[PDB]
């Protein structure tokens, strides 16, 4: 009956159901003293604390312990009364076959968990999967759907390219690149001097004003990503829809490109979500 | 019982059966991630995606992998219930003998395929072949049949000339020329500057308004093609029926020629089809 | 006085001067910790490390930062004592006009750089440019020069066609295709399962024996490239000289083609170089 | 003349000269009653006792009081008669520039110290520095040098990655992680109940059989470290040489990994040393 | 109804209820002659004198005879008329589970005692527990709450670290270190000569001017404690709130640190108290 959409991502998780929201992808099984105060979930005896700790960089996220984050997001989005729902997940546009390994472990399965001590249960009627980026096309405005466009999702580690003709797809591909590599680049020179920064606590340093990120590093990253699209797409053609958090991160620099026609998707963070979410309304409803 | 007509072409495929239509000749065996969303056919274990990828420029189209496009067109035109049909193909007016290599591989053969996962089968009672251009004469209006006319099909790569006396043919020939050479000419100067266009994604650029095609390039192409007909035909004589997509592409420029009597065939795209299609009604029915 | 020839390429750079050689086209401006141990060049304050990092896929290589690779190759080929030389570059047979943008930035210019810390300078008397593929004709054996031949360079991203009559050219063209597309095809199915390969570290995987490249993928690539030459050349005619690294990559499969007369150029890697290099001896000497 | 190599480390110090050996990195300036019985060194009036006390966890070990441990190791390795030597230190592969701050304070300097009351002096002709991990490659067996390998040093607090092509480096990086974090994890749950353990006296508890370390904690640590290498290296590729004491600590669990090609370096403790030590023979001798 | 907060500590006890205050943690069951004149409490027949004698150094203070000090503090803070109250204790941020052993022995229990001969009774409605250091965050000023801060309590024997994001915690840990170790260090060299000082009567000697504490011993202690926080926190980041009596003891030396942003909490002695005390108002009121 209900519908829930979850983009696990690699650094951020974005959920939309009865209530929408997002949080950080950090997950840790490390033992903790003051359990009351943190967000956590316990499944079949193993406990995990969310929003802190490691980052789960493993590629092919079909098997990167997509276990605690999913249930936590389901509990946060919907309410306790809800028991049966329809899940619509978003996988990268290249790892589709892994959905076979997904459905087998989820479809028609009842999951019981704690969610900060308030034990509850949940079941899912049927599971559905959509490519990343392609989903966002549905959230796109009508004025851009008619034309031949290119959905370009700039993920933390994955760039997703989906070229759409007039309501049809032509090209689909993925690139191993994203903001994580930029964070690694920054830490490569920061940790060198005397410091101990890592890819996790580095963005907050930029936000609070400790790391002085020169404007041209963003330009270098822009050139690098745009150097990873020429073999597959000519960005001057195929009016482009930038999506993902990296797009918001680089928008003021993207807007000054030598591209005839383009734009940065509004609410890009949830775009890939909302789009797929719209698709759900089309299928079950 | 049923009758189906298929013009494979070189850039476009045009089918007419219980339901008519057309699509692009692009075919690719390349591996694909998001199979659901594309049009495809799998035959004896090998899968091909239609409407995208390469273009299959091979001449003598009797052997240019006329395999996936044919079955896809048959499935799209007719319905699943249909099992036996009569196929009427259109070959160029010079490669007739290759029909011997065609019939042997098709007549009395049952083909099973997927067509986007919905497996089905189909058989063909008997195969029939007609020259290109000659077919369109049947689709022609009565007012032009009586006079001595010249059917001139301007294909993407082949120009077909068939001179008809009063219900009889006198001259028949083919020329290696068409819109593909024009696309090559345009890309020769476009790719030179900084770009990466090819013969496939170049027409769409003209359509959407990126390539500024000067009016006189069309005139140059017109002179080139009309320079390829003087040895065989005097266009002032032999009232001319222009057919093919190139005719629609150049019609407003053809209409201003110093020719006493001529015309551009209506629905030229399907003309060569409809004509031959009429012929089928004459033979089996 | 001296003469130096440099084929920048897109994946490999090939230099010949007083000392010949080649290396990889990978270039990175990324910050590096252990600078001693890598090959690098610093120009006007910006440092670049060669043989590692990105790949610079940008087409129209007249402006793809042809800056560090050039100076590094000049330093490696010649010696420190040399100050003035004559440069003979090789551009694709379609981007000639870009030579105007080249000469202006190079002719009569003195470049100072580090080359792994040993600072040095160099000047170039005059600059010269030759088409790709056409150059290799000079390196060709005499037995093939007399006949009407077709120089076919199979680059990593560009196919160069130059048809030569008896010591004269007739046809000249370029196609966007090469081994880079093959690498993209392989990674399209490899990255899908669970992996993280890209177009850079994929050839080494084939070489060391991790990727199982089926024999028929090479055949598919051969058909694709040979499907990109029919509109311009009939390979049965115009005895063919295959050049480029891709020719060595596919030679044992090229040798089994239904072509009456052909061959694979020896030392094809440097052929395009040596040929043009011979031309230099003709002009200045 | 003589050559001495010193790996200060963070928990253990490893020296090799005329006589090889190792000891603990614990250093304390705390006042002591029974000075006779402990190992100590007094430099310019300040006394320090080695093998007991604090642990000097400060990162960027270029300035973590690398003062008493160094002289103590020099005295223990060589003999009293020796006056002039050549020092070859090992720094992490990311803090190279700090060598500038090192040489200035050491090169051409005479150090006098007590070494348990037997006053002596020593001078160093010239100082040399090598990256950690990279050094161990020289100690590696010939059978592994030819292939493209990955030196992976698992330090107490630092993971050092150095990817070597055929006798050349491609990738170099550091991660803040090691056995110290594992000790912190263990104490996090041990100290909680009633105890007072710290990161220093915790390994001895495991060795003597008081802390019951479940087998799966080692697996968790293995996954954590292997989660810190995917962005930079694919361990299935790049045949891996594990080095460092942590490798010996986890070897029986490393040996059961799903890695096609790998190994644990013999005498890993001194590997990083011996390797660099070999390098010294190449330079001065 | 009433609310009472008690920080037992290890050397000092700090109570706040209807009347606030503090005293020394010294407790002795030793027989005493002149009982009138000392502060004491007798519980179930056993008498204890407060403010003199031993010091109760036992770690895991959930069971270090937290019996007489508690009742004495309750009697001193509130008045005789009060019978029922709500207790809010402060435990270290690592020994939470011991609260289970606490509540069972206190919740819903009536305690009768003497308190210097004036017999009285008291009951507690419900018991509540909070981590040390975390509590002080509530007492903190608003200007520091919004930012990502680090509460650092420097106890007599325990260092408590609690890293707070924007109103949320991320890291929580404890270290065995404090002013008691400093007192032990001082006595190690004082008792050596001819004296008989211990960890109890040593601070008073500093206060009254008998022990000449060199300024650099405080610096050594500062470095030692700051050497015990690098693995868990980078003090340059995470604006720091120093709390505890040791902070007041070292404040003039803390203020001269190379830290960009920090401060010493006002009334740090009661900070950990007041904070938790505020929390009580939030829960019951
Ligand atoms: N409000 C914001 N302002 C600036 N940058 C943001 C904001 N929200 C997210 N980002 C950036 O966008 C990135 C999030 O990418 P994300 O969409 O989580 O990757 P993926 O889609 O692959 O999961 C982060 O690295 C973050 O720096
Ligand atoms: N609706 C249209 N408007 C303008 N041009 C068209 C249209 N449809 C087709 N064309 C042009 O006609 C050509 C199609 O030729 P086609 O009939 O497919 O060749 P062939 O008959 O040899 O298969 C294309 O190159 C296209 O540019
Ligand atoms: N010794 C060799 N053996 C097998 N393949 C090779 C060898 N040398 C080069 N190649 C292949 O040839 C290609 C080099 O093409 P290249 O000549 O650099 O392109 P371009 O001429 O466009 O710069 C590479 O992709 C590589 O796989
Ligand atoms: N003989 C041994 N048996 C088991 N474990 C050992 C042995 N020797 C050292 N170790 C482990 O290896 C670690 C030493 O790491 P080390 O090489 O000193 O770090 P670094 O290289 O960063 O200085 C220690 O934590 C210790 O537990
Ligand atoms: N007014 C003061 N002036 C100077 N130092 C003080 C003062 N009050 C307390 N101290 C110091 O602070 C310490 C008290 O620490 P405390 O907060 O009791 O530890 P805990 O919080 O672990 O119980 C004592 O060692 C004392 O020397
Ligand atoms: Mg994403
Ligand atoms: Mg046709
Ligand atoms: Mg080339
Ligand atoms: Mg080490
Ligand atoms: Mg305290």
Chain A residues with CB-CB distance to B208 below 8 A: 147-148
Identify which of A94, A97, A227 has the shortest CB distance to residue C58: A227
Q: From CA D157, how far away is CA D228, in angstroms rounded?
A: 13
**Class of the CATH domain delimited by B2-133+274-284:** alpha beta
Chain A residues with CB-CB distance to D192 below 8 A: 31, 33
Q: Are A188 and D97 within 8 A, CB to CB?
A: no
Q: How far is D120 from chain C (nearest CA, A)?
A: 36
Judge if the beta carbon of residue A12 lies within 6 A of ligand 1: yes
Q: How far is D93 from chain C (nearest CA, A)?
A: 7
* E and C make contact (3+ CB pairs below 8 Å): no
Terminal-residue alpha carbon distance, chain B: 9
**A83, A35, A250, A59: which is closest to A154 by C-alpha?**
A250
Please report, for residues A143, E245, E253, E265, E267, the alpha-carbon distance to residue E248 in angstroms, rounded to integers and kept in the order given: 65, 5, 10, 9, 9
Q: Transcribe E194-247 into DSSP letters.
A: T----SSSSHHHHHHT-S---HHHHHHHHHHHHTTTTTT--TTSSEEEEESHHH
Q: Is the Cβ–Cβ distance between A172 and A96 less than 8 Å?
A: no
Q: From CA A231, how far away is CA A224, in angstroms rounded?
A: 13
Q: From CA E251, how far away is CA E263, in angstroms rounded?
A: 9
Burial annotation B79-109 (CB, 10 A radius, 16+ → b, else e): eeebeebbbbbbbbbbbeeebeebeeeeeee
- In the block, tokens 């274990």 appear at B45
Q: From CA B199, how far away is CA B184, in angstroms rounded?
A: 6
Q: What are phi and psi of A15, to 5 degrees?
A: -120, 145
The sign of the dihedral angle between the CA atoms of D267, D271, D275, D277 is negative
Judge if the beta carbon of residue A133 lies within 6 A of ligand 1: no
- Ligand 2 atom closest to B155 (CA): 22
Q: Is the Cβ–Cβ distance between B90 and B14 less than 8 Å?
A: no
Chain E residues with CB-CB distance to A33 below 8 A: 93-96, 131, 172-174
Q: Transcribe chain D into DSSP letters.
A: -EEEEEE--SSEEEEESSS-EEEE--EE----S--BTBEEEEETTEEEEESSS-----SSGGGS--SHHHHHHHHHHS-SS--EEEEEEEE-TT-TTHHHHHHHHHTT-EEEE-STT--EEEEEEEEEEEETTTTHHHHS-HHHHSS-EEEEEE-SSEEEEEEEETTEEEEEEEEE-SHHHHHHHHHHHHHHHT----SSSSHHHHHHT-S---HHHHHHHHHHHHTTTTTT--TTSSEEEEESHHHHHHHHHHTTSS-SSEEE-TTHHHHHHHHHHHHHHHHT-
Q: Subunits touching B (CB < 8 Å, at least 3 pairs)?
A: A, C
- D38, exposed or middle or buried, with CB in 10 Å at 0-12, 13-18, 19+? middle
Q: How far is C188 from chain D (nearest CA, A)?
A: 17
* B and C make contact (3+ CB pairs below 8 Å): yes
Q: Are C52 and D170 within 8 A, CB to CB?
A: yes
Task: Tell me the CA–centroid distance for residue D174 and ligand 9, in Å.
Answer: 11
Q: From CA D51, how far away is CA B249, in angstroms rounded?
A: 89
Residue C62: how many CB atoms within 10 A of its CB?
23
**DSSP code for B52:** S
Alpha helices in E44-115 (DSSP H): 68-77, 98-106
Resolution (A): 3.9
**C78, C181, C180: which is closest to C121 by C-alpha?**
C78
**B193, B188, B186, B192: which is closest to B211 by C-alpha?**
B186
Task: Tell me the CA–centroid distance for residue A8 and ligand 6, in Å.
Answer: 7
Identify which of A96, A147, A170 has the shortest CB distance to residue B33: A96
The protein residue whose alpha carbon is closest to atom 22 in ligand 3 is C155
**E250, E206, E199: which is closest to E226 by C-alpha?**
E250
Q: What are phi and psi of A86, to 5 degrees?
A: -120, 120
Please report, for residues A197, C31, D96, D105, E236, the alpha-carbon distance to residue A193 in angstroms, rounded to integers and kept in the order given: 11, 13, 9, 18, 14
Residues A12, A17, A21, CA angle at the centre, nearest 5°? 35
Region at B267 (left for phi over 0; alpha for psi -120 to 50; beta for the rest): left
3-state secondary structure of A104: helix
Q: How far is C183 from chain A (nearest CA, A)?
A: 11
Ligand 2 binding pocket (C-beta < 6 A) is: B 9-12, 155-156, 158, 179, 203, 244-246, 248-249, 269
Using beta carbons and an 8 Å cutoff, which residues of D are at the interface with C?
93-96, 131, 134, 147-148, 168-174, 230, 234, 236-237, 260
Q: Chain C residue closest to B183 (CA)?
A: C231
Q: Is the Cβ–Cβ distance between A150 and A240 less than 8 Å?
A: yes
> Quick one: tokens of B205?
């650029």
Asked whether the domain spanning A134-273 has the same topology as the one spanning A2-133+274-284, the reply is: yes
Q: Transcribe B64-86 into DSSP letters.
A: S--SHHHHHHHHHHS-SS--EEE
**DSSP code for B257:** S
Q: How far is CA A115 from the centre of its chain?
A: 22
Q: Are D237 and C33 within 8 A, CB to CB?
A: no
Q: Backbone breaks in chain D (C–N > 2.5 Å) follow which residues?
A: none
Judge if the beta carbon of residue E11 lies within 6 A of ligand 5: yes
Chain C residues with CB-CB distance to B193 below 8 A: 60, 95, 97
3-state secondary structure of E39: strand
Q: Is the Cβ–Cβ distance between B39 and B116 less than 8 Å?
A: yes
Q: From CA D109, how far away is CA D122, in angstroms rounded?
A: 9
Q: Is the Cβ–Cβ distance between C208 and D148 less than 8 Å?
A: yes
**E232, E231, E229, E238: which is closest to E259 by C-alpha?**
E238
> Quick one: tokens of A236?
């001057």
3-state secondary structure of E46: strand
The protein residue whose alpha carbon is closest to atom 14 in ligand 2 is B245
CA trace torsion A117, A123, A126, A127 (10° rounding): 20
Size of chain C in residues: 285
- D201, exposed or middle or buried, with CB in 10 Å at 0-12, 13-18, 19+? exposed
Task: Tell me the CA–centroid distance for residue C225 and ligand 1, in Å.
Answer: 41
Residues D205, D210, D213, CA angle at the centre, nearest 5°? 85
Q: Are D198 and E175 within 8 A, CB to CB?
A: yes
- Residue D259 CB contacts under 8 Å (≥ 6 apart), including other chains: D235, D236, D240
Chain B residues with CB-CB distance to A147 below 8 A: 208
- A46, exposed or middle or buried, with CB in 10 Å at 0-12, 13-18, 19+? exposed
Helix and strand numbers (H, E) in chain B are 9, 14
Judge if the beta carbon of residue C174 lies within 6 A of ligand 3: no
> Quick one: tokens of C121?
């300078």
Q: What are phi and psi of B42, to 5 degrees?
A: -115, 125
Task: Tell me the CA–centroid distance for residue A275 and ligand 6, in Å.
Answer: 13
**Class of the CATH domain delimited by B134-273:** alpha beta
3-state secondary structure of B253: helix
Q: Is the Cβ–Cβ distance between E83 and E124 less than 8 Å?
A: no
- Ligand 3 atom closest to C8 (CA): 23
Pocket perturbation via mutation, ligand 5, pick of E58, E92, E151, E246 by most ligand atoms within 8 A of CB: E246
- In the block, tokens 């050397």 appear at E11
The protein residue whose alpha carbon is closest to atom 13 in ligand 1 is A245
> Quick one: tokens of E188?
């190690």
Domain boundaries, chain B: 2-133+274-284, 134-273
Residue C101: how many CB atoms within 10 A of its CB?
12
Q: From CA C145, how far away is CA C148, in angstroms rounded?
A: 8
Chain E residues with CB-CB distance to D193 below 8 A: 60, 97
Burial annotation C108-142 (CB, 10 A radius, 16+ → b, else e): eeebebebbeeebebebeebbbbbbbbbbbbbbee
Q: Is the Cβ–Cβ distance between B277 and B88 less than 8 Å?
A: yes
Q: Are B196 and C230 within 8 A, CB to CB?
A: no
Q: From CA C174, how far away is CA B190, in angstroms rounded?
A: 12
Q: Is the Cβ–Cβ distance between A29 and A38 less than 8 Å?
A: no
**A155, A166, A154, A147: which is closest to A237 by C-alpha?**
A147
- In the block, tokens 């098709």 appear at B106
Q: C38 has which bridge partners?
A: C36
Task: Tell me the CA–centroid distance for residue B269 and ligand 2, in Å.
Answer: 7
Q: Chain E residue closest to D193 (CA)?
A: E95
- Pairing between strand D239-243 and D149-154? parallel
**DSSP code for B97:** T
Q: How far is CA E143 from the centre of its chain?
A: 25
Chain A residues with CB-CB distance to E173 below 8 A: 33
> Quick one: tokens of A244?
């993902």
Q: From CA B132, how far away is CA B151, in angstroms rounded?
A: 10
Neighbours of ion ligand 9 (CB under 5 A): D 9, 155
**DSSP code for E96:** T
Pocket perturbation via mutation, ligand 3, pick of C5, C8, C12, C179 by most ligand atoms within 8 A of CB: C12
* C and A make contact (3+ CB pairs below 8 Å): yes
Using beta carbons and an 8 Å cutoff, which residues of A are at the interface with C?
59-60, 63, 94-97, 173-176, 185, 188-189, 192, 220, 224, 227-228, 230-232
Q: From CA B4, how far away is CA B276, in angstroms rounded?
A: 10
Which listed ligand is nearest to E156 at the C-alpha?
Answer: 5
- In the block, tokens 């495809």 appear at B40
Size of chain E in residues: 285
Chain D residues with CB-CB distance to C210 below 8 A: 236-237, 260
Size of chain B in residues: 285
Q: Are A38 and E169 within 8 A, CB to CB?
A: yes
> Quick one: tokens of C113?
């750089």
- Residue D49 CB contacts under 8 Å (≥ 6 apart), including other chains: D27, D28, D29, D30, D32, D38, D39, D40
> Quick one: tokens of D60?
């960027």
């Amino acid at each position: 009956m209900k519908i829930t959409v979850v983009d696990l991502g690699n650094i951020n998780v974005k959920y939309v159901g009865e209530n929408k929201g997002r949080f950080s992808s950090k997950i840790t099984n490390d033992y903790q003293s003051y359990e009351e105060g943190f967000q956590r979930v316990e499944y079949n005896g193993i406990k995990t604390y969310i929003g802190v700790g490691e980052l789960s960089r493993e590629f092919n996220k079909a098997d990167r312990d997509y276990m605690a984050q999913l249930l936590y997001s389901l509990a946060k989005a919907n309410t306790a009364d809800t028991k049966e729902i329809n899940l619509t997940l978003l996988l990268p546009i290249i790892q589709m076959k892994n959905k076979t390994r997904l459905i087998e472990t989820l479809k028609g399965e009842n999951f019981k968990f704690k969610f900060n001590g308030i034990d509850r249960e949940i079941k899912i009627n049927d599971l559905m999967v959509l490519p990343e980026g392609y989903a966002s096309y549905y959230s796109l405005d009508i004025e851009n759907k008619k034309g031949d466009v290119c959905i370009l999702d700039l993920g933390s580690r994955t760039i997703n390219i989906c070229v759409l003709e007039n309501a049809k797809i032509v090209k689909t591909n993925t690139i191993k690149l994203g903001s994580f590599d930029f964070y690694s680049k920054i830490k490569s020179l920061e940790n060198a001097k005397g410091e101990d920064y890592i890819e996790e606590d580095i963005q907050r340093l930029i936000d609070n004003g400790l790391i002085k990120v020169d404007s041209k590093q963003y330009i270098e990253f822009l050139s690098d990503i745009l150097n990873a699209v020429k073999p597959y797409v000519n960005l001057k053609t195929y009016n482009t829809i930038f999506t993902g958090g990296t797009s918001l991160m680089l928008k003021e620099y993207i807007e000054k490109l030598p591209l005839n026609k383009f734009k940065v998707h509004p609410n890009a963070l949830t775009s890939n979500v909302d789009g797929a979410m719209e698709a759900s309304k089309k299928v079950w409803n």
